[PDB]
Every structure is written in structure tokens, then in C-alpha cells.
Design a protein around this ligand. Structure first.
Ligand SMILES: [Cu+2]
Ligand SMILES: [Cu+2]
Length: 123
């Protein structure tokens, strides 16, 4: 089945990964005209349980860490932080994913998590 998804930064509020896929790719795109540094976006994947932890410590860490705490072991996958006309794409092992667990995708650029947030599920 398909196992890439195109996301603009969110047009989708919800991703489902086909249980039959071995890998999965998120192509992320930035729509506007502003520098990564005043209006950059990422796509981060953690379990719902961990989302808020990744976000707050990611805010605390700088632009220079792409707004993610270094060695954050609760982050399953993510795209680089990106700005205007920059695109990024992350490909992860689907074996990292457990059917019947609730995952969240989100943006860790300060504040964007309240609107740029979604659900991903292995099904
Ligand atoms: Cu397939
Ligand atoms: Cu954003």
C-alpha cells in the first residue's frame, strides 16, 4: 500500500501507516515566505504520552538545536526544522511503531504545537 505522506506546514490532522509497510516517509513542505528563524516548522513523532515533554524541552533548547532537546530518546522520528522554500522528508522503521498505541505528530517551533499537531496510528 502507500507509505509516504505529503504534509504542508497542517493540511492533515491525521496519518495512518499501513501495518504492511516496512518503512514510512513524511515529506514536509513550508508554504510561506519567512526565514526558518522567525517562522520555521518541523514534524516530530512521539507517543501521546511523551508529546508535551518533547515540546517544552524542545522549546527550551534553541533554534540552534532545531527546537528539540539533544538525545531526546522519546522522539521516534522527525524532520529538520525548515523555513520558506525549504522542504524535508524523514523515513523511519515501521518496526519502531506498535499497533494499538497512540502516537502524536507535532511541530516544536515555539508555539506551533497548539495548531500544528496530529495523530498517527499503525493500522
Ligand atoms: Cu507496500
Ligand atoms: Cu510551525
Amino acid at each position: 500500500a502507500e507509505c509516504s505522506v505529503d504534509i504542508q506546514g497542517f493540511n492533515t490532522n491525521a496519518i495512518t501507516v499501513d501495518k504492511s509497510c516496512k518503512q514510512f516517509t513524511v515529506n514536509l513542505s513550508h508554504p510561506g515566505n519567512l526565514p526558518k528563524n522567525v517562522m520555521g516548522h518541523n514534524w516530530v513523532l512521539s507517543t501521546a504520552a511523551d508529546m508535551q515533554g518533547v515540546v517544552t524541552d524542545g522549546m527550551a533548547s534553541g533554534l540552534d538545536k532545531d527546537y528539540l532537546k539533544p538525545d531526546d530518546s522519546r522522539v521516534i522520528a522527525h524532520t529538520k526544522l525548515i523555513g520558506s522554500g525549504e522542504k524535508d522528508s524523514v523515513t523511519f522503521d515501521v518496526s519502531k511503531l506498535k499497533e494499538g498505541e497512540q502516537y502524536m505528530f507535532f511541530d516544536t517551533f515555539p508555539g506551533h504545537s497548539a495548531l500544528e499537531k496530529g495523530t498517527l496510528t499503525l493500522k
